């Protein structure tokens, strides 16, 4: 049995009770607790739980201000001694190290808190600067270098070597000829996967916690997430344009096929975002109705597009299962996450009351942390695919809608659909070809 300081000289000594901490029914899992009780477990001396640090530092802002967090972890660091060598070894040391762990993490991965509040940084520097002791010296100097590093301002090693860039009708350096059919479907998929993979990897938790991407300053707080969704929406729309603007049935059939091949390579690359960009295009109002066009799509392809569409069926039942099984790298579909985060935050109380005592509902924050954590896990692994500057540039600059407002363009596309394949009983007219090059696909097998 180890004695703790007097709860009168050290607030974090109060014994646990149903009135300040609740546990979920293998270390303990905190359902709810008081800010004090939380920070006590945040730096508990009995066991280790880095997950708690990430969780807490990702979501604390909803129940505790930055300035206050600091003041509290500082109080936690300054522990009064009442065996003394036992208490130091089993209580003060672990705790104090863990408080320094929280400071290190806070400054390293949530630095924006200090960027937006200069006095917080000042206090942090001052605090770190007051940590005396040869022991803590190691860490103190580290947190310091990290802070300075962060104030003034990533290589990749691969198992194997990236495959060879594939070309078709368009040749290196002739960006003016680049188009859906003249580029190699394999590279199209490849380049778009990298692009989309970077876009995904760039999204930070701060753009997600608090449903901020859905609020009015979403443009200021969730720039990367928005930039990502918008690329996806454009790509989908481009696919739709390409299809309804190719009026000749024989050429149009050629286009949809190519797109389905691209989808196939996406599947291969685990770029589920791309998969859905395609599925969504095919299911759009303009495309969905082109019966004469899908009529002529080979059966192997129709099967590919159907299996892809089944992923989203029954609330992404199969999609979720497949991501849980594949082997990264992969580009997940962000949409799913956005909905669960939002719904988790709206369907759960910010606090639970026990005997008139509002305890922060931590299980709510833990749940949202699980989601952001899941996102981050898939963000680590980089694709081993060589970039093609020009092709890259090509898709980065695609602008399907031009200067048209969404609705106008949207109606345009649908009308286009009605023109190239009129509602029955109206008769199916014939249209002149538009591509002056061969429409045969180079297939999706990489040349070696």
């Amino acid at each position: 049995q180890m004695r703790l300081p007097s709860a009168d000289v050290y607030r974090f000594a109060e014994p646990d009770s149903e009135e300040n901490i609740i546990f979920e029914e293998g270390i303990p899992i905190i359902k709810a607790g008081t800010v004090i009780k939380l920070i006590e477990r945040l730096t508990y001396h009995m066991y280790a739980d880095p997950n708690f640090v990430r969780t807490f530092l990702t979501t604390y802002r909803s129940f505790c201000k930055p300035q206050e967090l600091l003041s509290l972890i500082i109080e936690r660091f300054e522990i009064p001694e009442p065996e003394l060598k036992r208490f130091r070894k089993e209580y003060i040391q672990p705790v104090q190290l863990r408080v320094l762990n929280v400071c290190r993490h806070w400054v390293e991965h949530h630095f924006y808190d200090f960027e937006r509040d200069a006095y917080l940084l000042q206090r942090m520097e001052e605090f770190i600067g007051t940590v005396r002791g040869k022991a803590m010296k190691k860490w103190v100097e580290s947190i310091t270098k990290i802070i300075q590093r962060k104030k003034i301002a990533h290589n990749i090693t691969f198992q194997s070597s990236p495959p060879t860039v594939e070309w078709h009708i368009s040749r290196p350096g002739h960006i003016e000829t680049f188009d859906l059919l003249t580029l190699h479907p394999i590279e199209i998929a490849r380049q778009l996967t990298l692009l989309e993979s970077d876009l995904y990897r760039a999204v930070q938790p701060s753009e997600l916690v608090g449903s901020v991407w859905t609020k009015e300053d979403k443009e200021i707080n969730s720039p990367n997430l928005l930039k990502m969704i918008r690329h996806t929406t454009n790509l989908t729309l481009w696919f739709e344009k390409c299809i309804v603007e190719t009026e000749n049935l024989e050429e149009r059939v050629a286009v949809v096929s190519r797109i389905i091949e691209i989808l196939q390579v996406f599947q291969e690359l685990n770029n589920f975002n791309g998969v859905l960009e395609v599925v969504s295009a095919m299911n759009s109002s303009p495309v969905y109705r082109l019966d004469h066009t899908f009529e002529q799509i080979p059966s192997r392809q129709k099967k590919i597009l159907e299996e892809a569409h089944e992923l989203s069926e029954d609330h992404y039942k199969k999609y979720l299962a497949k991501l849980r099984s594949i082997n990264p790298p992969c580009v997940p579909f962000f949409g799913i996450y956005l909905t669960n985060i939002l719904k988790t935050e709206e369907g759960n109380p910010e606090v639970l009351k026990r005997h008139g005592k509002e305890l922060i509902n931590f299980s709510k924050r833990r749940k949202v942390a699980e989601i952001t954590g899941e996102i981050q896990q898939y963000q680590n692994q980089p694709y081993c695919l060589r970039v093609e500057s020009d092709i890259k540039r090509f898709f980065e600059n695609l602008n399907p809608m031009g200067n048209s407002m969404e609705k106008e363009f949207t109606d345009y596309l649908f009308n286009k659909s009605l023109e190239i394949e009129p509602r029955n009983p109206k008769p199916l007219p014939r249209f002149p070809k538009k591509y002056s090059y061969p429409l045969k696909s180079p297939g999706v097998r990489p040349s070696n």
Binding site: K31, S211, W213, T214, K215, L226, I229, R230, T232, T233, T236, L237, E240, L276, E277, V279, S280, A281, N283, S284, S285, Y288, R289, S312, H315, G335, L338, T339, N340, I341, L342, K343, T344, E346, G347, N348, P349, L352, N361, S363, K364, K367, I371, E406, K407, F414
Partner: protein, 166 residues
């Protein structure tokens, strides 16, 4: 038993998510988990008839505009929601109705107009206003306060009745 596929459309910020949650969820449990299997399904009795409500709420994915048509098509009935303190969302109601009518390829699609109270801000869309819009479309109008649970069941059940009587 019959299964109805209900879709909840509308501009973001109007509480669409509080509606679905307030319907499905157990209101006497501390924690609620959306990621949990079939937390979107619920068996209910409507006018003595038992059926299964399968609800599609894509709250938070509003920005993914190109996926609208896909999500909407999976539905038999639609809940067009707008916040009563947000005029823009109200005005968006029309386009949503047109978009639904398009993918479903019908001028007669089961749907309900829902005015939702999200908070205590000043109301900006007057009951009568929605009333009149709902009538011009020839569809029912229900006002709700998803947070105080008022109106939610009415909103959903009314729609099921629409589907049945279609």
């Amino acid at each position: 038993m019959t299964e109805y596929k209900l879709v909840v459309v509308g501009a973001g910020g109007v509480g669409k998510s509080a509606l679905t949650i307030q319907l499905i969820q157990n209101h006497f449990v501390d924690e609620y988990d959306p990621t949990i299997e079939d937390s979107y399904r619920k068996q209910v009795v409507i006018d003595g008839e038992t059926c299964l409500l399968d609800i599609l709420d894509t709250g938070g994915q509003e920005e993914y505009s190109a996926m609208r048509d896909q999500y909407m098509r999976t539905g038999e009935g639609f809940l067009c929601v707008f916040a009563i303190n947000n005029t823009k969302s109200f005005e968006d109601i029309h386009q949503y109705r047109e978009q639904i009518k398009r993918v479903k390829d019908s001028d007669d699609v089961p749907m309900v107009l829902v005015g939702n109270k999200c908070d205590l801000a000043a109301r900006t869309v007057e009951s009568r206003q929605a009333q009149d819009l709902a009538r011009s479309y020839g569809i029912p109008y229900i006002e709700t306060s998803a947070k105080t649970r008022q109106g939610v069941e009415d909103a959903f059940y009314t729609l099921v009745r629409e589907i049945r009587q279609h």
